[PDB]
Ligand binder design. Structure first.
Ligand SMILES: [Mg+2]
Ligand SMILES: [Mg+2]
Ligand SMILES: [Mg+2]
Ligand SMILES: [Mg+2]
Ligand SMILES: [Mg+2]
Ligand SMILES: [Mg+2]
Ligand SMILES: [Mg+2]
Ligand SMILES: [Mg+2]
Ligand SMILES: [Mg+2]
Ligand SMILES: [Mg+2]
Ligand SMILES: [Mg+2]
Ligand SMILES: [Mg+2]
Ligand SMILES: [Mg+2]
Ligand SMILES: [Mg+2]
Ligand SMILES: [Mg+2]
Ligand SMILES: [Mg+2]
Ligand SMILES: [Mg+2]
Ligand SMILES: [Mg+2]
Ligand SMILES: [Mg+2]
Ligand SMILES: [Mg+2]
Ligand SMILES: [Mg+2]
Ligand SMILES: [Mg+2]
Ligand SMILES: [Mg+2]
Ligand SMILES: [Mg+2]
Ligand SMILES: [Mg+2]
Ligand SMILES: [Mg+2]
Ligand SMILES: [Mg+2]
Ligand SMILES: [Mg+2]
Ligand SMILES: [Mg+2]
Ligand SMILES: [Mg+2]
Ligand SMILES: [Mg+2]
Ligand SMILES: [Mg+2]
Ligand SMILES: [Mg+2]
Ligand SMILES: [Mg+2]
Ligand SMILES: [Mg+2]
Ligand SMILES: [Mg+2]
Ligand SMILES: [Mg+2]
Ligand SMILES: [Mg+2]
Ligand SMILES: [Mg+2]
Lengths: 157, 98, 217, 57, 112, 146, 46, 49
RNA sequence: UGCUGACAUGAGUAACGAAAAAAAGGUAUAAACCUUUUCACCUAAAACAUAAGGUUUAACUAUAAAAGUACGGCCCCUAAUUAAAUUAGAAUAUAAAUAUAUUUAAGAUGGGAUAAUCUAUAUUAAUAUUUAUCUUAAAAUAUAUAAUUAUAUUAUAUAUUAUAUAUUUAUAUAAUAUAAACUAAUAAAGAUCAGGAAAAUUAAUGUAUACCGUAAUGUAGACCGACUCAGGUAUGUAAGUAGAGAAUAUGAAGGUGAAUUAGAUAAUUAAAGGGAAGGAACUCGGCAAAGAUAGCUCAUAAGUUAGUCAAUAAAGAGUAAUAAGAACAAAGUUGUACAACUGUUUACU
RNA sequence: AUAUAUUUAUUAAUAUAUUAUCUAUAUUAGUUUAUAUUUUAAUUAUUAUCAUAGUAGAU
């Protein structure tokens, strides 16, 4: 009489209305999970009703839903998985090349909107200043690459 | 064409133009003249048209009267084959046609 | 066999009143990868609609693909008549044609650019297309309503048109835009699609319930 | 000119630092024919179906 | 063909620096630019002055930049939520760093 | 090939007037539409709750904490095994989840620090390491209790 | 015709013939792996 | 510095080789480290393990 | 012609690898980067969409979004084939290693339900290679005055008008509407070279829909060739005009115009165009170059193994061409030696 | 059709200037065309590019 998609929709509606899970909870209970998730800054292709996380590679879509709901009360209406690639790198040419980690990221659809806080101004917070790190690296590369008479060339760092 | 000048083949208008009975045939596996070691043990044998081997009867144990339904060309041999049907039970069989 | 479906041809108001498969409405979908917008008369679409709407694609306005995950419903506009629904669909397609072929120079004149003079993008995602789609919807609705305005009780007061948005944030300023006398007189409202279920996956169910509500106002 | 700051041939590649390297590194999800499936230990949840679907346990 | 013996320092140096056609010539044909007393080449214009006039032309004929209204009247929070930042690759970083692979012309000396 | 002996083809047949079926659509789009400026989506239309559960990923609703906001290492210490020995199962469970939530906040701050600004302050890292120390102490205690 | 392009890459064949299992599932391949271990090589097989 | 390296432990062998440098070659790395840092950053004492 | 390392001579020489580019502005910074306009080049591609491969090279770290109905993989099933697996003391044989036969497991380049009026896979109740689409049919038209032929049609793809509804879902349908190509589903039928394997229905409950691929490159600067190498590399679409055609000419959209530029254009070298008088006098040799008087419809000999084999005969005719005025297909006879013929061969003399 | 200026207590004819000669439906599945319907969506004089300098007669 009712399609299974319609039945799923009424299931989710009933869950929200009754305040319980909007999904079916599994039987493999995990009392002490040590998984960590990383909230990410929105992209131009997302809407204020979406949030993206960096999650464990062995993580799952249902796992993210359950984790968010039970630990934070956030209801993810639709979850979507984006598993990234690992590019080859080598800290120097005289070392074995090895692939970078493959990071897993999931986007969740929410019910109420969210906008991140403002960027801090350079003078407000000490950790949020790229001048000192970037200048240190530029001095690093200049000193490592100054071969001959460039040692007397005035530096720009 | 020069390839048709010396092509002769007997024609039997009574032969059956359709397919054989599938239940009495098996796919014929091609070996290429190579044995279980993969080496050519019989030369000059190789690629050809896909074929099915027909399970024809050489024992004729059953007995009784059987009517020949049709005569067919069997690519796995040189003689024609005859499809039989038993008068009492109706089971179908293949034999060498005289 | 019955090769031809409802979504195959372009269906006029006579067809819509003969079948009554859906009430008078037009669907507008957003592409989650390229930011483009697709218009349809039905809750679904096929390759013919994509071909009709992306006629002259370039490295900026690439021709999108029919992978159902990247297509999502932006809005559902509910009108008072099948004539008006067809009129609005035709207006939207015509204005897309004007924007991409006939009057591309002025479309570009108005678009945003970054350094190097390219239309602003993040990846292959260009926000300007959704905004242009909303502007075209406003313009087409304005023309559609301007065409006919009985403003009298001939047989019934008739129902009031609506726009069901995926999210209130998509439409711009409600006062600097969407604040004209035609819309106010017709009583156009701006409603929202309910978020009480997996909207992306159960899109069809949600839209069908909305269609039933509109059919029985 | 690939890079406007290098007008002459000096050894720099179109992209990257080295064209060669070790190829005996372990594989991952992005590499292989369409038939290759490695996985991420994220789904031992249910049973595959005889037709191709998947039923959650 | 192929050399049969290594050429001596004498032979190489006299072959290269010996003949006068291979030697750079002192530039005698310099004079004073009438618009500014600086050095310039004879039967040639002065780059400082030519560029100055071209700069005047640019400042007086530049086409007004195009700043769309919908963008110029857009709030900072909306700009941040619609047009977020991004990370520039090494290629674009170097490309943006322009003063390390482009040289401006150098002024000549004042002729007195 | 088109030689010069070629003969032009005739025009293909045309159905007479009295037999042509009229089109089902007799009216079309308006020939007066004009290209209008795009309308950006405005955030003024949103009512974002201040108690949104995504704020639990920030401390005091700060984008990224300052050295002053962080807890000084002198005043902080991880839990001890004997102190966790006599905490009920509910208390250990709740402490575990509080630790995980704090670690998530520190994780996002540390990711922004090491990915965007690329600094080597390594403060959030050691703070999360202290939390992890408490966590495995809790695990040890529960195992030994059973 | 021209030569030099003898290596035509294909991960399927590369793994089937030079993969770790392709050697660990036999006497001879096991010996190759063991010899490389004894020499101390970092990478035993593709 | 966009690396994601702070999220996974990849190249364990190489990392251990770099972090367990032989003690008799330490001056080799000491030289580059010293000459690649500013005066207000460096100290005249030998880093210890 | 010792080995390694450093540095020389050739030498600031040869080269910078098929190529259309020019101004103005970004910038009194630019041949080389970006933008605009002009000009060109590829266009049955140098375009679009993909497979394989690869130092992510991409429109990038805020980064490539799937329950399925055009989503692939994963999974069920197997082909070729593989397997320290498998078989009363005893499967067989064997210097060891090991090799046979049988089972079982694995293994695509293959097969696998439903679905836009959108759909439902699970548990308990029984155990069809390959190839072709008629001389002849019926109406109305062009038809002639009995022709007979000239054709939609001698078979399918859908939308409108009317005869009806269960409070207009499925039908019985009579009319209206196609020019040339192509597609997937029928029906009938031709030769011999005779054309894969494998996993079974109703009921009652049941479905909260896992994992992985998804960027860009992909007749290539993003793979295999030691190079940003004129080489090698798998599919589908591939505007219109013109044609028998996917030939050839153009090129609408798209993409592009290149790690070399500006002058000058000696001898000489390469690729290309023209040539008075003569026409193989060159040379070992007509090597190279030149030579086409329809491409459609006619017509086409001697020999002959009877096969328009010779034959795409040669020469010739019809069709506007009469001083000529695109590209492409089409390059003459004859004797002899050898070999029946199509085919295969010394990857690189 | 836009823009500046008027013939009454948007705007008609002029001075001109700028931009365009499109789209969209039907004819049983898809592509092309052809004709109907919709729309303002045109038919004369010069010019250029490409086809070996595209081609032949001169110079
Ligand atoms: Mg996925
Ligand atoms: Mg023999
Ligand atoms: Mg869906
Ligand atoms: Mg390579
Ligand atoms: Mg791949
Ligand atoms: Mg090699
Ligand atoms: Mg092999
Ligand atoms: Mg020389
Ligand atoms: Mg020379
Ligand atoms: Mg030279
Ligand atoms: Mg310039
Ligand atoms: Mg061609
Ligand atoms: Mg063509
Ligand atoms: Mg491509
Ligand atoms: Mg799938
Ligand atoms: Mg199997
Ligand atoms: Mg397969
Ligand atoms: Mg791909
Ligand atoms: Mg793609
Ligand atoms: Mg080579
Ligand atoms: Mg190449
Ligand atoms: Mg062509
Ligand atoms: Mg063009
Ligand atoms: Mg390209
Ligand atoms: Mg070049
Ligand atoms: Mg020259
Ligand atoms: Mg001559
Ligand atoms: Mg002559
Ligand atoms: Mg002679
Ligand atoms: Mg002679
Ligand atoms: Mg010749
Ligand atoms: Mg004769
Ligand atoms: Mg004769
Ligand atoms: Mg020829
Ligand atoms: Mg021969
Ligand atoms: Mg031959
Ligand atoms: Mg040879
Ligand atoms: Mg051309
Ligand atoms: Mg030319």
């Amino acid at each position: 009489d009712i399609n299974v998609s319609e039945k799923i929709y009424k299931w989710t509606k009933a869950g929200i209305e009754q305040g319980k899970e909007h999904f079916k909870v599994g039987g493999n209970k995990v009392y002490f999970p040590k998984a960590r998730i990383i909230l990410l800054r929105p992209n131009a292709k997302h809407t204020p009703y979406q949030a993206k996380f960096i999650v464990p590679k062995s993580f799952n879509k249902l796992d993210l839903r359950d984790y968010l709901y039970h630990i934070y009360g956030l209801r993810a209406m639709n979850i979507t998985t984006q598993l990234l690639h690992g590019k080859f790198n080598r800290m120097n040419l005289q070392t074995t090349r090895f692939r970078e980690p493959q990071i897993k990221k999931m986007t969740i659809e929410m019910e109420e909107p969210f906008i991140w806080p403002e960027e801090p101004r350079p003078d407000e917070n000490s950790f949020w200043d790229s001048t000192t790190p970037d200048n240190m690296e530029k001095y690093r590369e200049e000193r490592l690459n100054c071969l001959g008479s460039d040692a007397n060339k005035p530096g720009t760092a | 064409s020069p390839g048709l000048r010396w092509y002769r083949s007997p024609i039997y208008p009574y032969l059956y133009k359709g397919r054989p009975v599938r239940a009495l045939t098996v796919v014929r596996k091609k070996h290429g003249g190579r044995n279980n070691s993969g080496k050519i043990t019989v030369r000059h044998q190789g690629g050809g048209h896909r074929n099915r081997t027909r399970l024809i009867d050489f024992n004729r144990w059953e007995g009784g009267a059987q009517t020949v339904q049709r005569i067919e060309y069997d690519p796995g041999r040189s003689s024609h084959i005859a499809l039989l049907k038993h008068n009492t039970t109706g089971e179908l069989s293949y034999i060498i046609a005289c | 066999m019955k090769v031809n479906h409802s979504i195959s041809r372009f269906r006029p108001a006579s067809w819509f009143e003969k079948t009554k498969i859906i009430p008078p409405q037009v669907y507008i979908f957003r592409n989650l990868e390229y930011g483009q917008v697709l218009y349809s008369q039905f809750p679904n679409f096929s390759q013919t609609q994509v071909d009709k709407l992306f006629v002259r694609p370039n490295w900026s306005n690439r021709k999108p693909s029919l992978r159902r995950d990247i297509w999502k419903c932006m809005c559902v506009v509910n009108l008072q008549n099948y004539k008006q629904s067809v009129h609005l669909y035709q207006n939207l397609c015509r204005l897309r044609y004007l924007r991409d072929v006939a009057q591309r120079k002025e479309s570009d004149k108005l678009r945003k650019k970054d350094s190097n003079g390219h239309v602003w993008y993040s990846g292959q995602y260009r926000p300007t297309y959704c905004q242009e789609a909303v502007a075209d919807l406003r313009e087409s609705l304005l023309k559609v309503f301007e065409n006919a305005t009985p403003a009298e009780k001939q047989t019934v007061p008739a129902k009031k048109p609506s726009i069901y948005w995926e999210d209130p944030w998509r439409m711009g300023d409600k006062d600097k835009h969407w604040n004209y006398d035609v819309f106010n007189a017709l009583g156009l409202e701006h409603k929202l699609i309910q978020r009480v279920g997996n909207i992306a996956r159960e899109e069809s169910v949600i839209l069908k319930e909305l269609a039933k509500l509109e059919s029985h106002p | 000119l690939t890079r406007p700051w290098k007008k002459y041939r000096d050894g720099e590649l179109f992209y990257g630092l080295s064209k060669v390297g070790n190829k005996r590194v372990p594989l991952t999800t992005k590499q292989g024919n369409k038939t290759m499936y490695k996985g991420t230990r994220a789904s031992g949840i249910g049973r595959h179906t005889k037709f191709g679907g998947y039923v959650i346990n | 063909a192929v050399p049969k013996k290594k050429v001596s320092h004498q032979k190489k140096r006299q072959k290269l620096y010996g003949p006068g056609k291979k030697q750079l010539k002192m530039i005698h044909h310099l004079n004073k630019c009438p618009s500014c007393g600086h050095y310039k080449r004879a039967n040639t214009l002065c780059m400082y002055c030519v560029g100055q006039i071209s700069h005047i032309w640019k400042t007086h004929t530049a086409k007004e930049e195009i700043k769309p209204r919908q963008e110029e009247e857009l709030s900072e929070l909306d700009q941040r939520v619609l047009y977020p930042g991004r990370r520039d690759t090494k290629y674009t970083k170097d490309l943006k760093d322009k003063d390390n692979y482009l040289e401006r012309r150098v002024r000549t000396l004042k002729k007195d | 090939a088109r030689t010069k002996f070629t003969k032009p083809k005739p025009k293909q047949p045309v159905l007479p007037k009295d037999k042509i079926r009229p089109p089902t659509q007799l009216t079309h789009h308006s020939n007066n539409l004009r290209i209008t400026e795009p309308i950006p989506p405005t955030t003024s239309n949103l009512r974002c709750p201040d108690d949104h559960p995504l704020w639990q990923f920030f401390s005091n609703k700060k984008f990224i904490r300052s050295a002053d906001d962080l807890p000084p290492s002198s005043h902080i210490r991880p839990w001890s095994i004997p102190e966790l020995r006599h905490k009920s199962f509910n208390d250990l469970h709740s402490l575990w989840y509080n630790c995980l939530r704090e670690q998530n906040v520190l994780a996002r701050e540390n990711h922004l620090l090491k990915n965007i600004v690329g600094s080597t302050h390594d403060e959030f890292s050691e703070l999360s390491n202290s939390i992890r120390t408490t966590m495995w102490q809790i695990r040890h205690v529960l195992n030994e209790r059973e | 015709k021209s030569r030099g392009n003898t290596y035509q890459p294909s991960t399927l064949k590369r793994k089937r013939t030079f993969g770790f299992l392709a050697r660990a599932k036999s006497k001879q391949g096991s010996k190759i792996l063991k010899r490389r271990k004894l020499k101390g090589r970092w990478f035993l097989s593709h | 510095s966009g690396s994601y390296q702070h999220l996974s432990n990849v190249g364990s062998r190489v990392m251990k080789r770099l972090g367990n440098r032989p003690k008799n070659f330490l001056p080799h790395s000491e030289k580059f480290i010293k000459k690649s840092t500013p005066e207000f950053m460096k100290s005249d004492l030998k880093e210890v393990d």
